[PDB]
Amino acid sequence: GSAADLELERAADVKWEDQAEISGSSPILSITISEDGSMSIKNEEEEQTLGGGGSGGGGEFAGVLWDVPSPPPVGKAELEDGAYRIKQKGILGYSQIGAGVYKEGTFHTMWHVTRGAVLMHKGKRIEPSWADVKKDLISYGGGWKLEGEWKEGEEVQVLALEPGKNPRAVQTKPGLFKTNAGTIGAVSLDFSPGTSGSPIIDKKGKVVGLYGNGVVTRSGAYVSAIAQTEKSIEDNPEIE
């Protein structure tokens, strides 16, 4: 709605040992390209996820911070970083539309969550420091960095952030999806889709990427591409 007021509502913390549920590996599915960075199945519909966290009791204020054991101790930079849900939260309206991963000192999320619009946390207006529409992702704090590349050969692990629910640690075996251009690499699986912005971890308990470049294919078989840390601190490298 507001498309200028998106609150971070924490779903979980980034550490793959939730439920290790076996799945993955599905027939190479056809998918129709749209706006260069997006796809759908010919003419596909869309729905809000909806989320509850982020109370209206001083929901704007200025910045009360989401990382408080005691009342705000003048720290001004405390971050309960992890697997977040991106809800579009107007200061008088709450509607979840995607997800995002904040870890270390960088928040990497997705552009199609609304309009690549500004985030917020206790009314602190978290405005992007990077946004790439072509891959259709966003970075805050600099570029997308964390140092976490999924190694293609093994299973990809996804903290599938179930809508308004607990995460699901799923062992997904990789797959492909063919456009009019050609076949692309992803997790193509017939199963319930998570929120676009769920963390992609590798089976070693390391990696921290992002799931959401695709749609519900066939009639609900979620196909989305496997994104990983490609950028840097900002001007400085990944680490060295």
């Binding site: 596909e44 519909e45 869309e46 729905e47 996820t49 539309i97 995607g98 997705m110 199609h112 969550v113 809508p163 889709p193 998570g194 929120t195 676009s196 959401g212 749609v215 519900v216 979620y222």
Partner: peptide
């Protein structure tokens, strides 16, 4: 439902 997309879900995206």
């Amino acid at each position: 439902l997309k879900r995206x």
